[PDB]
Amino acid sequence: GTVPVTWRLGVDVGERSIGLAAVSYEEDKPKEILAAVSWIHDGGVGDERSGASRLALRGMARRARRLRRFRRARLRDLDMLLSELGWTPLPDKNVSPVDAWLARKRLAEEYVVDETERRRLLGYAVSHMARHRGWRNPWTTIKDLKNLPQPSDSWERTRESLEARYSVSLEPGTVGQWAGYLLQRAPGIRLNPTQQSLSNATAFETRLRQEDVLWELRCIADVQGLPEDVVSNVIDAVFCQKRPSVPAERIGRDPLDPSQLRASRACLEFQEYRIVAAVANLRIRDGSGSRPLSLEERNAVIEALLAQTERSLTWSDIALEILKLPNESDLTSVPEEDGPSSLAYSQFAPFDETSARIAEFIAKNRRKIPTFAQWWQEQDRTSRSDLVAALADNSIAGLLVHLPDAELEALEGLALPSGRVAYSRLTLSGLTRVMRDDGVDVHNARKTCFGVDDNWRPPLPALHEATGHPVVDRNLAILRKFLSSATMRWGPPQSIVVELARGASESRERQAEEEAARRAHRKANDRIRAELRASGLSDPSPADLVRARLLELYDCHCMYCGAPISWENSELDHIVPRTDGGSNRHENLAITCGACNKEKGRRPFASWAETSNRVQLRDVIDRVQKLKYSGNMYWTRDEFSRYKKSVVARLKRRTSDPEVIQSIESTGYAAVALRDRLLSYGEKNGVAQVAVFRGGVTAEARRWLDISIERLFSRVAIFAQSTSTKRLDRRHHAVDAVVLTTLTPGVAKTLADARSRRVSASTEEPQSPAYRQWKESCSGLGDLLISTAARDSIAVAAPLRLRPTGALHEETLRAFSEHTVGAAWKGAELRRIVEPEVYAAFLALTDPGGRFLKVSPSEDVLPADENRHIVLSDRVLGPRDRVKLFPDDRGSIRVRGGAAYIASFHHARVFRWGSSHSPSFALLRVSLADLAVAGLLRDGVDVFTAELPPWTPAWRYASIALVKAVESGDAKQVGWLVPGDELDFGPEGVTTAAGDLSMFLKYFPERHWVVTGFEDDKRINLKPAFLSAEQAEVLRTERSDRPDTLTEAGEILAQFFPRCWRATVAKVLCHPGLTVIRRTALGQPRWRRGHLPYSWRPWSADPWS
RNA sequence: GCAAGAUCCUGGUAUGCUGGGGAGCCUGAAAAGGCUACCUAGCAAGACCCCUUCGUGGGGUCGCAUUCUUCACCCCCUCGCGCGAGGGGGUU
DNA sequence: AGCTTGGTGTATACCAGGATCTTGC
DNA sequence: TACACCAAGCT
Ligand SMILES: [Mg+2]
């Protein structure tokens, strides 16, 4: 069904959104908007406040499980060792709570004569030290831990603070003695400082280290006279830490031999490859030109580089001593940073550094390891390269020599070079063998050995392959679904245009730094706005604010010339002129005095001045170094030191600072990854070109095309001055993408030049034949955009989460309540009955035929019946015998002998009952705990349709009308809803509005809403699909601070958000013509039932099957 | 060659929560309640694998990611000689 | 008595390195 | 953070 049309793809990438457009083109002018959709994604984020991704929380939970399992294994091993030595471990109960601490204190203070008591206290102390060993660097081995200073410096300062606070001298002041003494002397003291939460200083204030516990253990061994073998055994069993590896398939494959794994720095193949390659780059000046060096010369330099032991041969000592030339200037192509007096040659040439390190460590331990040293010197170079490949790559999960526990231990802790070079060791050897013989470079040996063509490149990642970054993977998945659907619809695109708009590769740390920085940017500007308005300024310009800030900080000082200045004597001085490669930044400006202003003369500032009279450097830069931070000004603490060192680094320039550089279309991770994947798709499908722009760019394209979002979507003006931003309406992303289908790199370069000249202040229209051709080609694009916005065609969809995977319950365990069988049972207490079989029995008492429990929470269901017996399957419950109940009347499950609340709901099943002209609706809210305890988290279950038992918290805490209707049999499941489902109320909109919602719909007549939650058994939470919560919160903040900068519509929007429409389900689903819109990847609603989620009407939905 | 970021991954730590305890203090002082700490076990529910002592309990791995679950169709990587496990896509 | 709305609890926070990029000279 | 959950107010 594919009809090939000439169409272009436009992709507007954001942090939380992506706008996607397919626009069909007739004659280099846009003809039809085939699809336009904004997709609102979470950026892969699972913790909404900490910024941690879903993958990060999954990895943290997995590693906590691995930690607990290995810790249990090592405690079992210590228990076996203590049973072997006949030492009693600390029991699980019936002991004093300071037996372990007093045991450590007694064994580290005095000698215990009784053998049984000594062994019991020793077992108690060793078991407790295994439970509380403290932290160690995980990459250090046990000997590396044992060679640390004993005790540590941190514990030494903590100990000195402990005498300075308590005036007692414990010798030796170990952590066990100190903690036990402070518990016996000041009971109820806290040993370690807690998180978050009237004041009490804790006993210790630094994190306990493993060397402190190790020092205490050996001190106990010294005082109690333990033999050294059992001391080493208890040390190895207490401090048994697993080795931090780097597991396989996480290390990149070879571009040339993709079965073979990546190679390391310390692999000798890489040092010899670096030597031969760096030799082969070098061009000897011969024949009045650059001729690459001869074979005898390259063999002499390479043989003189693989046999060294230090960084001895440098680039100034190769050209005139081995290459045999008269001049060091006769050699070129040296891949280092250039400088005067051969600054590249001043550093040292690359050499076999791993062999040097191994030779030096041999020279320090050859008497310790003669077998290794003799094997290293005498055995073959291939075998020793394999040996270093087995000692540097041993820190990988997936020891080839089978040597004993101490003959290799002198080198198991050796620190080799570390890293990952782009080729594999087999490929490095293969390309090595066709350099030192044939004298050809990597550029020829790569073709020769593996038989690849001249135009061969490392292969591009496909669209189906992930990146591992959450934001990039979300944008990538949405992009690849849109592109697959558009390719099946209208064939492959003629071109693909992308632009990213900031917000990547920063963790969203810089999000918090951006908001707390625009806070200062828009607050400290108000001071120099209002005080100059009080002065009398009537023409507001940013330059006046900049010079006012410089006067505010520098206190109106020509620092060089003296002569105190004023507002009129400002003379804003650009340190770097734009004729020498600069830009209009606030770093570049310094306040001057007239005499200290014009004398620079385009020369490097504070360099002509120091090479003259009346003025010198070395003082003012020190004053900037000791600059105290003012708490009320533009620049924050994080930008403070960076600004100060940037000012110093541009003041101390003794040469040029080039140049007038403009961005060259590839700067980010997401841009590189998306570009490579779109190039892979294009080379597999026939796309003529693929470009990835920036900015910033499409806003100016809309400005010079005169395209306004408010004229598109008829939005009200939320600000008093000017109109709203584009970021108010989410559809603007797809609008931008539609505009991105019109551009090329040339017209984008002209627009970027227009941006730099307009912000460098104007206003200036762009002049170019390409720009004029672009402007008269896409003149009708705005007409197309109007006819697309009026038809309600630009969709805003959120991707659905249908997998029944995630946190099943809340983390906090809660104590059970207990209730007697023969008392008065309320509805709440009947709802909280933990045991499902006892629960079903109590339902059989209240309603013998009813499958579900229909009780008011406040109703008194049963009285105190003192002769009530509960007949269970295996036993009988007497009227005085207690029954476990959940602590609160809300959804909870049994986990590990404790009660946990259920998590956020995975979905809500929609139930409809009654007459078709006016039916009632309810939501059965289903969480992950419901499917977990119902046995539905197994492979082969439709979790949105499969029935739940009556004892699940979904059916316990459903609405009463839903329970009665399901008992009556007139209620059927007609669909489900997930957080993110789109509700389309149609042209009618929200007819049943009440309260603030009504006045919200007076100014924002929203017909599309998004399911965001299910706050109780009768209410669904909805937010408007086309309106942005981030824009609404920045208007909320601007109402909280700025005076009357919002219109009444902005007031209503700010008061509506973020809780939005907390709606009664009856009020929502009693709207006729309300539909639940599940969209395809192109934004079109899915209305045909296949094997994908389809649009449905709660009014007109039939039951299942 | 080189200063560094981001993304995870691996190894740990200290609290916290619940169950079992209790050193000190407070109520009860007949009695067992509370608080401050500390000791100990567990810290997703669970699923698969292996024992042989066909049972009785004990060891290993996976388990909050890839947002259209499962089902069904199509493509791709590894192993199979179809198909077991991972990815992807599905137009209204 | 049922719908609007206001407030509030929720596991939490560190360390040392290693592998994929990205950079930006 | 935002969602589920707890009451008070408004009519
Ligand atoms: Mg955008």
From TrEMBL:
InterPro entries reported for this sequence: Cas9, Cas9_alpha-helical_lobe, Cas9_b_hairpin, Cas9_C, Cas9_Topo, HNH, HNH_CAS9, HNH_nuc
Record-linked Gene3D superfamilies: 1.10.30.50, 3.30.70.3520, Ribonuclease H-like superfamily/Ribonuclease H
Domain HNH Cas9-type residues, every copy: 503-665
PROSITE patterns xrefs: HNH_CAS9
GO process annotations (BP): defense response to virus
UniProt-annotated binding residues for Mg(2+) 5: 12, 733, 736
Entry keyword annotation includes Metal-binding: yes
Cofactor(s) annotated in UniProt: Mg(2+)
Keywords: Antiviral defense, DNA-binding, Endonuclease, Hydrolase, Magnesium, Manganese, Metal-binding, Nuclease, RNA-binding
Pfam families on file: Cas9_a (PF18470), Cas9_b_hairpin (PF17893), Cas9_C (PF18525), Cas9_Topo (PF17894), HNH (PF01844), RuvC_III (PF18541)
Biased composition (Basic and acidic residues): 505-524
Record: residues binding Mg(2+) 6: 573, 597
PANTHER family with a match to the protein in the record: OS07G0170200 PROTEIN, SLL1193 PROTEIN
Subunit structure: Monomer. Binds crRNA and tracrRNA.
NCBIfam families: cas_Csn1
This protein's name: CRISPR-associated endonuclease, Csn1 family
Species for this entry: Acidothermus cellulolyticus (strain ATCC 43068 / DSM 8971 / 11B)
